[PDB]
Copies of this chain bind each other. A is one copy, B any other.
Amino acid sequence: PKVSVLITVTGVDQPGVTATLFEVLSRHGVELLNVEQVVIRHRLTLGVLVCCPADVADGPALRHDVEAAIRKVGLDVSIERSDDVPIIREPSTHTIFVLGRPITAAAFGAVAREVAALGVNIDLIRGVSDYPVIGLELRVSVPPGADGALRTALNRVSSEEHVDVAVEDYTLERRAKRLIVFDVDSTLVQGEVIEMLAAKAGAEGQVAAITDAAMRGELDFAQSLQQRVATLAGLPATVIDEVAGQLELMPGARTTLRTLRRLGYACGVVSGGFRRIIEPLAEELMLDYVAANELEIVDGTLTGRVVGPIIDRAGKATALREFAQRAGVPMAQTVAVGNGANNIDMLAAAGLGIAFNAKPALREVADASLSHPYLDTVLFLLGVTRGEIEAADAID
């Protein structure tokens, strides 16, 4: 008790160092206040903050015991009275994810520069993936009222340097995300279902043009939906099952859902597409919630119309809110993932809105953007590491 002492051990890592130090300290009236240790690339840092009798800390014996024991095996140690020293470091305010393929040193350099410019302190850096993409996390302490400036600065770095850069709240509450919705077309599934339907009518051309036109936000979603589905007027309803069986999951989708289930997420899809194509898949993927539009069928033939209500841009956010209320999950703990202007209100409503290989209209307002063709890069944004994924998967 009485007086506090800081002991700092550094150098090339060797086994037994940790036990040796506290065994030495036990010969003095040492009680512990804080221990921090890590080994990085065979470099040990062990910082031990203690209190011990004023008697002991004022004597050369504690110093000599520690210095002798540490220096003998080949490491460095410093010892100094503290008293005016933080016992335990404060939590980081935010975390930053940098994803690239590659991540140039220039890219990472620009991130570190923007960070320093805004008075943001880097508390820790670690890797979170080596595949399918290089992933690096920085946990940071952002000055109050500066994280807007920071997201802006880092989105600029992101486009200039060809990496994804996401800044997230690192508070207890915001980290415990519990619910996720995916847009279907070009997010969970490869391509555009409505274009696969249109191709059966020899209309993939017209419909692709309008689809690409609607997802960039240059058109009202409902009017574009009505013109596109009209091109299907006269197709037999059998086409629906046929397109259902041609659907390819986005690379990384099974891994994304599976891992999200391990974490107890409630998972759903919210689509402007069609319930009949989506359900025999949501069932196969064991999803908890589906919202979608519905094709009108007369005499076993599509009419080219949709049965209202239409899930539009507002409808997607409305669906998220509905799902979250039923699931008992506050909006702050919800995640939304999408690629088109169709998805803007949904990402905005969600706690974390993630644009996945998205049109500019969506990236401009999303909380975070992903530019690589791997849906499982979403998991990294959710605080999961690749190693953790592979571990849990290997355990089966």
Give the interface of A toward B (CB within 8 A).
6, 8, 10, 15-16, 18-19, 22-23, 25-26, 28, 30-41, 43, 45-47, 49-50, 87-91, 100, 102-106, 108-109, 112-113, 115-116, 122-130, 134, 136, 171-173, 176, 178, 259, 262-264, 329, 333, 384-389, 391-392, 395
Which residues of chain B are within 8 angstroms of A47 by Cβ–Cβ distance?
40-41, 43
Q: Are B26 and A36 in contact (CB under 8 A)?
A: no
Interface of A is mostly: mixed
Question: Given A37-B124, A112-B18, are A104 and B387 also a contact pair (CB < 8 Å)?
Answer: no
Copies of this subunit? 2
Which residues of chain B are within 8 angstroms of A263 by Cβ–Cβ distance?
172-173, 176
Q: A98 → chain B, closest Cβ, in Å?
A: 9
Question: Given A47-B41, A386-B88, are A26 and B106 also a contact pair (CB < 8 Å)?
Answer: yes
Question: Given A6-B41, A36-B127, A124-B38, are A385 and B91 also a contact pair (CB < 8 Å)?
Answer: yes
Which residues of chain B are within 8 angstroms of A391 by Cβ–Cβ distance?
90-91, 171-172
Cα distance, A131 to B387, chains bound together (Å): 33
Q: Are A50 and B105 in contact (CB under 8 A)?
A: yes
Q: Are B172 and A392 in contact (CB under 8 A)?
A: yes
Which residues of chain B are within 8 angstroms of A172 by Cβ–Cβ distance?
259, 262-263, 384, 388-389, 391-392
Q: Which residue of B lies closest to A42 (CB)?
A: B8
Q: Which residue of B lies closest to A261 (CB)?
A: B173
Most buried by B among A25, A40, A41, A385: A41
Q: Are B388 and A22 in contact (CB under 8 A)?
A: no
Q: Are B387 and A88 in contact (CB under 8 A)?
A: yes
Q: Which residue of B lies closest to A333 (CB)?
A: B264
